Scaffold this active site. Structure first.
Site, PDB file in Angstrom:
ATOM      1  N   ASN A  10       0.849  -1.179   0.000  1.00  0.00           N
ATOM      2  CA  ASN A  10       0.000   0.000   0.000  1.00  0.00           C
ATOM      3  C   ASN A  10       0.890   1.235   0.000  1.00  0.00           C
ATOM      4  OD1 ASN A  10      -1.958   2.024   0.186  1.00  0.00           O
ATOM      5  ND2 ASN A  10      -2.796   1.372   2.202  1.00  0.00           N
ATOM      6  N   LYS A  12       0.175   4.259  -0.457  1.00  0.00           N
ATOM      7  CA  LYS A  12      -0.553   5.425   0.036  1.00  0.00           C
ATOM      8  C   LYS A  12      -0.196   6.645  -0.772  1.00  0.00           C
ATOM      9  CE  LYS A  12      -1.260   3.787   4.616  1.00  0.00           C
ATOM     10  NZ  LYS A  12      -0.414   3.763   5.810  1.00  0.00           N
ATOM     11  N   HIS A  94     -10.207   1.629   3.537  1.00  0.00           N
ATOM     12  CA  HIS A  94      -9.039   1.725   4.347  1.00  0.00           C
ATOM     13  C   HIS A  94      -9.261   2.736   5.444  1.00  0.00           C
ATOM     14  CE1 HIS A  94      -5.235   3.188   5.701  1.00  0.00           C
ATOM     15  NE2 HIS A  94      -4.694   1.978   5.467  1.00  0.00           N
ATOM     16  N   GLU A  96      -7.859   5.004   6.823  1.00  0.00           N
ATOM     17  CA  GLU A  96      -7.634   6.430   6.625  1.00  0.00           C
ATOM     18  C   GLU A  96      -8.839   7.077   5.940  1.00  0.00           C
ATOM     19  OE1 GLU A  96      -3.989   5.706   4.695  1.00  0.00           O
ATOM     20  OE2 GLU A  96      -2.875   5.843   6.568  1.00  0.00           O
ATOM     21  N   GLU A 166      -7.323  -4.378   9.945  1.00  0.00           N
ATOM     22  CA  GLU A 166      -6.470  -3.358  10.505  1.00  0.00           C
ATOM     23  C   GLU A 166      -6.798  -3.045  11.961  1.00  0.00           C
ATOM     24  OE1 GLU A 166      -6.251   0.329   7.974  1.00  0.00           O
ATOM     25  OE2 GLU A 166      -8.318  -0.373   7.349  1.00  0.00           O
ATOM     26  N   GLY A 172      -0.445   4.056  15.174  1.00  0.00           N
ATOM     27  CA  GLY A 172      -0.081   5.395  15.610  1.00  0.00           C
ATOM     28  C   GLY A 172      -0.674   5.862  16.956  1.00  0.00           C
ATOM     29  N   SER A 212       1.243  -2.963  11.693  1.00  0.00           N
ATOM     30  CA  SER A 212       2.591  -2.616  11.227  1.00  0.00           C
ATOM     31  C   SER A 212       3.464  -3.809  10.881  1.00  0.00           C
ATOM     32  CB  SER A 212       3.300  -1.744  12.242  1.00  0.00           C
ATOM     33  OG  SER A 212       2.311  -0.972  12.912  1.00  0.00           O
TER      34      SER A 212
END
Lengths: 249, 249
Positions: A10, A12, A94, A96, A166, A172, A212
């Site tokens: 990915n 991004k 996704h 995000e 995910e 994060g 990750s």
């Protein structure tokens, strides 16, 4: 007894002409010994260059996103456009997008389907957040997402689907997921599919982990029983990706 | 006493390999007698093909959108990416984005600037809606938008700017804008720039109308005193675009 694994890059919102040139040269000189499906999903801007440069036959290209219909939707991109460009893989829902771009369980389900309807291969993303983890809501949550999708599919459609999980909670937030946890999650979804759709279906379905993954922690995670692959971030711009691939033997 | 006009094609979310091939062949065989700047803004997917095919020197390519920074922003595209791709023109704050994609006066101002900072040429869009028109709010509204932008610019930056005015009120509402109205609007903005920033600046600034322009109603609208061009939709996929261009003599 595993299905064919996937190692999806990915990229991004990153890249350049030179750098991406660099990586893809890497990819193409890499000897991929086993049955893996390598997926590379870049920017809309870079797809062509990518469509042109990857020649390694164990690799495909995909979109990081799209919208179901063409039209008066400025600066957006559609399925019909992608197909014409000859792109048969896409990533939808996704984290995000969900977070910064208003993607609810409902839009996703609606896109995956359409994508599904248009003959695409789909890596549909799911996962729960920190508050969701802590109040102990993981099941209740991911199941809900998966459902939302599933509501819209034929059983024969499950075959174009791929579920990457995910763990938004450790992405994060300063929080860390272990390989156990990852496994614990994939087993959840699988029981669902299984109990709910068909074990024939459950059996063959791929589940990637999109937390990750680096060149280190990778093997250890593929070894987990319910893990069939990766949805990678940073490492995917790096050469380590090659290591993550091998991690899937 | 007009500045150089612009005829920008906004292809929005449309196109194919063949069709776009078709159009661009059209464009390239077209003799553009006067000082016009032709702008073509397609999908991220089609930019390359476009960068490759348009060879007509009175034409440039642009993006329909972008985000200020690179990173973990899945399926989005950034300025830094575009520049590297060699794209020096962009359209920001188009009504469709504002409406379906959460673009406030604030994000826009922030992007235009950044775009501005990165050396892009910018067609910043503004306009008011139906309710805004009816309660008689047009001034109060467009000025506000323009401000939001302007707050963030140097005077020397105004030079990379272009303000296309979209009368959102008559765009798909069954309502019709006349050439008078269009003119009445452009004169508004101009007085603002003028009174507020510098008439040196006001004088040279281009203002396109982005309402509905076709091969018919075009001349009539360029004739208006404060009109310097077009931001076109549908017609832009058609050959009529060639007519709209000529309309700018």
């Amino acid at each position: 007894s595993k299905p064919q694994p996937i190692a999806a890059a990915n990229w991004k919102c990153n890249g350049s002409q030179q750098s991406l040139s660099e990586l893809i040269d890497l990819f193409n000189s890499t000897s991929i010994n086993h049955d893996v499906q390598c997926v590379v999903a870049s920017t809309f801007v870079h797809l062509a260059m990518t469509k042109e440069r990857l020649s390694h036959p164990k690799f495909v290209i995909a979109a990081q996103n799209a919208i179901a219909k063409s039209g008066a939707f400025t600066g957006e991109v559609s399925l019909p456009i992608l197909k014409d460009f000859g792109v048969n893989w896409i990533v939808l829902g996704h984290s995000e997008r969900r977070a910064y771009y208003g993607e609810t369980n409902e839009i996703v389900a609606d896109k995956v389907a359409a994508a599904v309807a248009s003959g695409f291969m789909v890596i549909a993303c799911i996962g729960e957040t920190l508050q969701e983890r802590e109040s102990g809501r993981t099941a209740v949550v991911v199941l809900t997402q998966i459902a939302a999708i599933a509501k819209k599919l034929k059983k024969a459609d499950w075959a174009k689907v791929v579920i990457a999980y995910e763990p938004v909670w450790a992405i994060g937030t300063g929080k860390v997921a272990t390989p156990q946890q990852a496994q614990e999650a994939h087993a959840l979804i699988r029981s669902w599919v299984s109990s709910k759709i068909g074990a024939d279906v459950a059996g063959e379905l791929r589940i990637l982990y999109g937390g990750s993954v680096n060149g280190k922690n990778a093997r250890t995670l593929y070894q987990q029983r319910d893990v069939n692959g990766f949805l990678v971030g940073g490492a995917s711009l790096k050469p380590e990706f090659v290591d993550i691939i091998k991690a899937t033997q």
